[PDB]
Short mmCIF file of C-alpha atoms in Angstrom, two decimals:
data_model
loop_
_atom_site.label_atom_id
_atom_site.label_comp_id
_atom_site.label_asym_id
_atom_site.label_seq_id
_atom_site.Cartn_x
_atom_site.Cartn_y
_atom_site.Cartn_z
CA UNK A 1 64.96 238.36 86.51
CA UNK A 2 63.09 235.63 84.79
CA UNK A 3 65.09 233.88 82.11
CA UNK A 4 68.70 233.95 80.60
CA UNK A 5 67.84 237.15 78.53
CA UNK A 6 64.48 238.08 79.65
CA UNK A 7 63.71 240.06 82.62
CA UNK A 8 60.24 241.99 83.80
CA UNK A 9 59.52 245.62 84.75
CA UNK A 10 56.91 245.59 87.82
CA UNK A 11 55.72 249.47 87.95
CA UNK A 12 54.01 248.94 91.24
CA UNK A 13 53.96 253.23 91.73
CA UNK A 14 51.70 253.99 89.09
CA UNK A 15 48.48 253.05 88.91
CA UNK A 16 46.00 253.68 85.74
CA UNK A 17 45.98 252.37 82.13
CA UNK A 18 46.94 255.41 80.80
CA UNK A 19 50.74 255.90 80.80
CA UNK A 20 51.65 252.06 81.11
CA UNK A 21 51.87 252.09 77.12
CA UNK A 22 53.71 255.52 77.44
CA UNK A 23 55.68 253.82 79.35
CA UNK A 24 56.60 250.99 77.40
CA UNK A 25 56.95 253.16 74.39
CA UNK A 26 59.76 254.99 76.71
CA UNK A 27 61.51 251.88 77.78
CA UNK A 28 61.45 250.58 73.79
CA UNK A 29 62.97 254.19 72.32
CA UNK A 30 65.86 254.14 74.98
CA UNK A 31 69.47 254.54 73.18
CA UNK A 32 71.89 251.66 74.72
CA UNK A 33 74.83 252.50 72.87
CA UNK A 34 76.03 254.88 69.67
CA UNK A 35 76.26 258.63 68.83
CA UNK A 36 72.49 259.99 68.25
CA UNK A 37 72.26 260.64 64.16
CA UNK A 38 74.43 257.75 62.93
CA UNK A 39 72.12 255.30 61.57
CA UNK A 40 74.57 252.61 60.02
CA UNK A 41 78.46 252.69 59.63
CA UNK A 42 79.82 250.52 56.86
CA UNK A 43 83.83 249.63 57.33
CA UNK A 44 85.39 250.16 53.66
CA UNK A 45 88.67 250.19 52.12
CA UNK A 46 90.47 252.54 50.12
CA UNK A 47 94.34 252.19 49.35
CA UNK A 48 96.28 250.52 52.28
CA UNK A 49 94.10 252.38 55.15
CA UNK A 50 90.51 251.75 56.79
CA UNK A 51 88.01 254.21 56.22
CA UNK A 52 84.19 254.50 57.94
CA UNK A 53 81.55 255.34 55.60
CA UNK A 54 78.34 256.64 57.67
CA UNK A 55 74.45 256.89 57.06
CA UNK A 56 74.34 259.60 59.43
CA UNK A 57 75.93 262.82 59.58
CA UNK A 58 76.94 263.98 63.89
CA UNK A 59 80.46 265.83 63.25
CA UNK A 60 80.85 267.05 66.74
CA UNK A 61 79.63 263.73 68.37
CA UNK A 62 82.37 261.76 65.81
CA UNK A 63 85.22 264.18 66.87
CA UNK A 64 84.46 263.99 70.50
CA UNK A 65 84.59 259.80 69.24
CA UNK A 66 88.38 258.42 69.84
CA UNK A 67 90.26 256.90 67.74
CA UNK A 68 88.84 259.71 64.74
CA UNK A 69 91.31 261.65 62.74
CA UNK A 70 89.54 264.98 63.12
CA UNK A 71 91.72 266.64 60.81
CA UNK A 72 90.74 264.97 57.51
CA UNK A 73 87.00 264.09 58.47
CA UNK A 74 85.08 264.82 55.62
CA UNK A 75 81.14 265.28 55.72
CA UNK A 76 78.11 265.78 53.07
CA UNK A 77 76.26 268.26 55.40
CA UNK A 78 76.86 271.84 54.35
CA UNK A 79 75.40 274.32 57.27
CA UNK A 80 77.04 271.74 59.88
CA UNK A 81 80.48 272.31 58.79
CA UNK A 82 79.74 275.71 58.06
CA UNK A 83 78.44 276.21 61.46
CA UNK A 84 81.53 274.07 63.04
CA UNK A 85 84.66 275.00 60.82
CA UNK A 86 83.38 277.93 59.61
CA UNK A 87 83.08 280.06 56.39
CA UNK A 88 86.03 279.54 54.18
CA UNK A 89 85.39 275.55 54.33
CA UNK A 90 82.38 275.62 53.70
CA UNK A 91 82.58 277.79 50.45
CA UNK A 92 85.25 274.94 49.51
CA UNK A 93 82.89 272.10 50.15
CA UNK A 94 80.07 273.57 47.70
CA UNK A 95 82.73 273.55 45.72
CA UNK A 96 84.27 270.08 46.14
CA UNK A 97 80.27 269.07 45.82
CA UNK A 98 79.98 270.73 42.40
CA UNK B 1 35.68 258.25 52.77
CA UNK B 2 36.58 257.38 56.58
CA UNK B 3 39.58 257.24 58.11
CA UNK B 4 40.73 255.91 61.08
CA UNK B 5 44.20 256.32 62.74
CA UNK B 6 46.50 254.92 65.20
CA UNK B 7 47.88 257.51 67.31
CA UNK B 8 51.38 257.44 68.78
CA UNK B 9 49.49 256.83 72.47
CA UNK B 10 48.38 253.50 71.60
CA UNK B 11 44.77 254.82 70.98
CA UNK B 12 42.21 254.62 67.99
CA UNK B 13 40.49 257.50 66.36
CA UNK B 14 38.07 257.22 63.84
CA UNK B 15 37.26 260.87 61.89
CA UNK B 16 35.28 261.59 58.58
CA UNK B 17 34.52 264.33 56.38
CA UNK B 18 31.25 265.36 57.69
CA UNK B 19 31.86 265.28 61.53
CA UNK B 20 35.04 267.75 62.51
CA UNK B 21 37.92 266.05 64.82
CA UNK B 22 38.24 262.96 65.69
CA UNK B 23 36.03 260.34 68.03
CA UNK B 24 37.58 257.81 69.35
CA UNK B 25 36.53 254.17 68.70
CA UNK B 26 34.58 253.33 71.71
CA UNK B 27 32.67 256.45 71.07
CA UNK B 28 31.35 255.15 67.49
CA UNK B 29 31.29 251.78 68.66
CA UNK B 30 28.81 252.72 71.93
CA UNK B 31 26.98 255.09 69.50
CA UNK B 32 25.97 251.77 66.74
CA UNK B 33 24.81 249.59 69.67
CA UNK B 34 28.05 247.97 71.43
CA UNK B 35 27.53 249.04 74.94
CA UNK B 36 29.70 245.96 76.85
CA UNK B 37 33.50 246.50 76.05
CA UNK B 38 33.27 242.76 76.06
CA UNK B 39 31.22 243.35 72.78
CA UNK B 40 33.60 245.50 71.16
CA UNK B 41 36.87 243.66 72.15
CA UNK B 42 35.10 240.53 70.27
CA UNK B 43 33.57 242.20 67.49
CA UNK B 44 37.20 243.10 66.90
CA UNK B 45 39.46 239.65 66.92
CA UNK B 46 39.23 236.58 69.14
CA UNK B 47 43.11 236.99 69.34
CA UNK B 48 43.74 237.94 73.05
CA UNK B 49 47.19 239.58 71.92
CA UNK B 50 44.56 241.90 69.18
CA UNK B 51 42.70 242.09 72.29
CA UNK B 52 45.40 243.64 74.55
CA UNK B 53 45.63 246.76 72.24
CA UNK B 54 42.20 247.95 72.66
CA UNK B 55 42.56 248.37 76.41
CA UNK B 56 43.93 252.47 76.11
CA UNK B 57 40.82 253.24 73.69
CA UNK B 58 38.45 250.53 75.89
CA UNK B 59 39.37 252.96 78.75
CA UNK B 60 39.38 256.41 77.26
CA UNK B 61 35.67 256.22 76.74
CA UNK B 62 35.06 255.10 80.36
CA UNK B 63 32.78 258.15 80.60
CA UNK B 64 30.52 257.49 78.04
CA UNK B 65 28.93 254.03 78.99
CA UNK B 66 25.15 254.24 77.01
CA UNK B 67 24.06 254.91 73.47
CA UNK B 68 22.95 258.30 73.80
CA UNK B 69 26.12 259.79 75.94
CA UNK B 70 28.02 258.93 72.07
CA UNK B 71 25.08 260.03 70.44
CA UNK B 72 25.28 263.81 72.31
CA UNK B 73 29.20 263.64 72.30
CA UNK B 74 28.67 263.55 68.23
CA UNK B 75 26.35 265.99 68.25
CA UNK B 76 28.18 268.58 70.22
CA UNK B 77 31.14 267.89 68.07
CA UNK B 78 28.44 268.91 64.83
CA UNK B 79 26.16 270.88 66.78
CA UNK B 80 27.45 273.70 68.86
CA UNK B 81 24.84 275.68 71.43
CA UNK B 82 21.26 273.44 70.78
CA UNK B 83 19.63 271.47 73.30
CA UNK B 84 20.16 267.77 74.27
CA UNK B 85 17.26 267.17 72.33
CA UNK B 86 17.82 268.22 68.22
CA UNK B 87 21.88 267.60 68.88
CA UNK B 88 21.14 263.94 69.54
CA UNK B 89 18.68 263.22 66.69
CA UNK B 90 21.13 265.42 64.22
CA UNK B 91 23.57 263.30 65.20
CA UNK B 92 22.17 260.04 64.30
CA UNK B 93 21.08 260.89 61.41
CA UNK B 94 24.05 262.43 60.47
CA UNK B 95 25.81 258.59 61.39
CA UNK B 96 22.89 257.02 59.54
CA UNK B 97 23.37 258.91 56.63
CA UNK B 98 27.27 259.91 56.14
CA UNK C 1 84.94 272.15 72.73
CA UNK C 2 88.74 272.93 72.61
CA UNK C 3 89.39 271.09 69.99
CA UNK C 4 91.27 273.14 67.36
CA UNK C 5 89.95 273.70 63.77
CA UNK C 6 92.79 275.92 62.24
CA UNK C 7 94.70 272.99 60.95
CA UNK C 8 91.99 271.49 59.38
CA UNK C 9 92.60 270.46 55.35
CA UNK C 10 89.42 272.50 54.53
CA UNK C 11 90.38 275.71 55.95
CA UNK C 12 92.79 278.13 54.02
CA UNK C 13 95.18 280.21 55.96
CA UNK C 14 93.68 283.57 57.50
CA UNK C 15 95.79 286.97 58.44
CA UNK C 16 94.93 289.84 59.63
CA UNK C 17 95.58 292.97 57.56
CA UNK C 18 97.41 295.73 58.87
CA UNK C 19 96.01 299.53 58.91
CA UNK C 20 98.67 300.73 56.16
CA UNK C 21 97.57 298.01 53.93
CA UNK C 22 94.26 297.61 54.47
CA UNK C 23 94.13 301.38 53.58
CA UNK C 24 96.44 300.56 50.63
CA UNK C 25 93.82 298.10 49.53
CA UNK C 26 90.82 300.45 49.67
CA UNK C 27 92.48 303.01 47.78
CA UNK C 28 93.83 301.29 45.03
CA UNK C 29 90.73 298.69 44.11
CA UNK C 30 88.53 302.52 44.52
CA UNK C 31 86.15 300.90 47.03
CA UNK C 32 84.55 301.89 50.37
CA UNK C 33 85.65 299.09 52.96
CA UNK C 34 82.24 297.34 53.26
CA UNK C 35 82.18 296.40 49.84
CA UNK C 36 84.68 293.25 50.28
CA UNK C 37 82.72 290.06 51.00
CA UNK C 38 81.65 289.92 55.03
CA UNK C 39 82.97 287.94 57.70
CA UNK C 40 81.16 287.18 60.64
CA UNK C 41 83.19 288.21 64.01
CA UNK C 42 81.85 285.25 65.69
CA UNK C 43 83.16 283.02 62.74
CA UNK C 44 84.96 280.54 64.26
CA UNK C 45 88.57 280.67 62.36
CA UNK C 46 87.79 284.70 62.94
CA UNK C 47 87.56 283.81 66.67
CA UNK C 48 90.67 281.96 66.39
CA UNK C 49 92.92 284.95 65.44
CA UNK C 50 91.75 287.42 67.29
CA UNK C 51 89.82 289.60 64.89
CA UNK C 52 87.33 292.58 65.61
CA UNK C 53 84.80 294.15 63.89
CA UNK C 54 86.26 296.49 61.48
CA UNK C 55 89.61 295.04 60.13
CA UNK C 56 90.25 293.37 57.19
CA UNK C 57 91.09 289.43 57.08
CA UNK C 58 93.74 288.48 54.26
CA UNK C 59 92.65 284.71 53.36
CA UNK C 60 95.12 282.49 51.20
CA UNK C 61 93.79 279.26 49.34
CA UNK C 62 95.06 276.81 47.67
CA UNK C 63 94.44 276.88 43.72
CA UNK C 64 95.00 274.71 40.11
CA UNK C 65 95.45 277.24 38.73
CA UNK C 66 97.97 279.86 40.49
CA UNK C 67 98.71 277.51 43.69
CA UNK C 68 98.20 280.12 45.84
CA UNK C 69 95.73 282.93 45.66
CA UNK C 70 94.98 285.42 47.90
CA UNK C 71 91.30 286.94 48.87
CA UNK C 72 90.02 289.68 51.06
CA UNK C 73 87.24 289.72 53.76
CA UNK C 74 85.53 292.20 55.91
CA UNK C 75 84.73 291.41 59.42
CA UNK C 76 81.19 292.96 59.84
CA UNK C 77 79.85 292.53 63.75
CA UNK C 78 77.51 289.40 64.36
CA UNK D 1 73.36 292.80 72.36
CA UNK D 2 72.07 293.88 68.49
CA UNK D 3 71.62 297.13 69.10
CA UNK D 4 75.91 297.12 70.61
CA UNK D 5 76.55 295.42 67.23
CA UNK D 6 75.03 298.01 65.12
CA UNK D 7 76.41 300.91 67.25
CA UNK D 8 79.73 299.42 66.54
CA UNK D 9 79.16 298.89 62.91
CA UNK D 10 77.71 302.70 62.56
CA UNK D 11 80.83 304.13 64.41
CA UNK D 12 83.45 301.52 62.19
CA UNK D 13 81.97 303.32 59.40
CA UNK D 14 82.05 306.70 60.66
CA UNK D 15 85.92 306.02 61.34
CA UNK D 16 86.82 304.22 57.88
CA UNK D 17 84.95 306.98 55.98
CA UNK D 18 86.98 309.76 58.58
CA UNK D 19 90.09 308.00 57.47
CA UNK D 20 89.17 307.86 53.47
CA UNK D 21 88.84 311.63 53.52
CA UNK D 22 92.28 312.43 55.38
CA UNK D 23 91.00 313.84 58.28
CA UNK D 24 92.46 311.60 60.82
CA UNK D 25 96.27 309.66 60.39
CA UNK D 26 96.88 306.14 61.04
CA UNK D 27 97.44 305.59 64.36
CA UNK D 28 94.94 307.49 65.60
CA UNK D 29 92.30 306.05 63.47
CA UNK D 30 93.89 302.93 64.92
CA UNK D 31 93.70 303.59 68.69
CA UNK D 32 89.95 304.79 67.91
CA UNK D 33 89.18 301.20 66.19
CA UNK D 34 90.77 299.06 69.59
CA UNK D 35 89.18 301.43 71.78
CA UNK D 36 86.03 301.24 70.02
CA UNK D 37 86.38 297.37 70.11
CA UNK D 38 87.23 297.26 73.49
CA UNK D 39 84.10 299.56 75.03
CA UNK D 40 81.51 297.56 72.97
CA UNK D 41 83.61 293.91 73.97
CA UNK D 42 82.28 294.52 77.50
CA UNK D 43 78.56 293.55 76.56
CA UNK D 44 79.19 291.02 74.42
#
């Protein structure tokens, strides 16, 4: 530790100046939180309920998510619903999209 | 036209039309005359945080430490199965003239 | 994943045909069997009933127009 | 594993266009479907 929110990495194993940047690239593209995809979710409302509008498109990752109605979750992507629900649903969202 | 990139391992290449590939920056800069990374890390900026970036291309030319070591590395990039000889003075006259 | 898709609001409702019918079927539209649209056997709402390569998948769907209508499928291996 | 699928779809054939012509009744043509399904299920 060094300060109230700043700390330091010591890396006494390796030793050359290749791979300390690699490093540090690493370290700076680590995930701390979130589903992988999602880039922003914007909280909207509709009628009298809350609905999530999303910048990303995960649907497996949001139904493993609590607290989603998987039943009624509704997504742009084609192939992943077509891959995930299956044939028939995807025939009626090209469709719906029309 | 010459072009010179930033690749995703914090190093510098510098490639043109004539010469095929890239060379890193150390290499051209050894090759016009700069033979003390001192030289090159102040013919760049007098900024030491400019200067911390050029420590991954700095070291990838750690080889190459005279003129003519850049000038044959250019010419066996242009000139494939000659002597030492002809591939360096192809070489600088291919950097003195393109 | 166990997570059930069959009561999702995009899928329709899926059946599978009986021999007599399915035979019915054939003979009166004048087809061979594998000229219905395909269905995967690895389809996922196929998966969910059960159905094998071979038999012939009744699908109902909601409609403007009718409210119900009612299409067939042909499960083709895959 | 493709070469089970398309044995399977070459002998549902066979036994749909066996049944179109009359030569086999129902139920047989049935139990040769299931146990058609069930000797090609064991690779897959």
């Amino acid at each position: 530790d060094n300060d109230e929110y700043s700390f330091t990495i010591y890396f006494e194993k390796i030793d050359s100046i290749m791979a300390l940047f690699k490093m540090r690239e690493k370290i700076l593209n680590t995930k701390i939180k979130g589903v992988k995809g999602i880039k922003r979710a914007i909280v909207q409302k509709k009628g009298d309920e809350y609905v999530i509008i999303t910048d990303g498109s995960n649907l497996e990752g949001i139904m493993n998510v609590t607290g989603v109605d998987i039943n009624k979750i509704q997504t742009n992507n084609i192939h992943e619903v077509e891959e995930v629900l299956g044939i028939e649903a995807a025939r009626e969202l090209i469709s719906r999209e029309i | 036209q010459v072009m010179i990139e930033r690749l995703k391992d914090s190093t510098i290449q510098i490639s043109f039309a004539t010469v095929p590939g890239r060379i890193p920056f150390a290499i051209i800069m050894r090759a016009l005359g700069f033979v003390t990374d001192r030289d090159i890390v102040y013919a760049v900026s007098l900024d030491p945080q400019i200067q911390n970036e050029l420590l991954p291309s700095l070291e990838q030319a750690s080889s190459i430490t005279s003129a003519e070591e850049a000038l044959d590395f250019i010419g066996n990039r242009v000139a494939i199965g000659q002597k030492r000889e002809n591939r360096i003075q192809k070489a600088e006259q291919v950097i003195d003239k393109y | 994943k166990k997570i059930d898709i069959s009561n999702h609001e995009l899928v329709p409702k899926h059946e599978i045909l009986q021999l007599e019918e399915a035979y019915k079927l054939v003979k009166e539209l004048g087809i061979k069997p594998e000229q219905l649209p395909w269905i995967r056997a690895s389809d996922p709402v196929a998966k969910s009933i059960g159905a094998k390569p071979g038999d012939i998948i009744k699908i109902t769907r909601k409609s403007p127009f009718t409210g119900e209508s009612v299409t067939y499928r042909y499960v083709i291996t895959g | 594993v493709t070469i089970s699928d398309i044995e399977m779809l070459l002998k549902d054939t066979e036994i749909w266009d066996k049944l179109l012509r009359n030569e086999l009744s129902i139920e047989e043509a049935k139990k040769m479907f299931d146990d058609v399904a069930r000797s090609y299920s064991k690779a897959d």
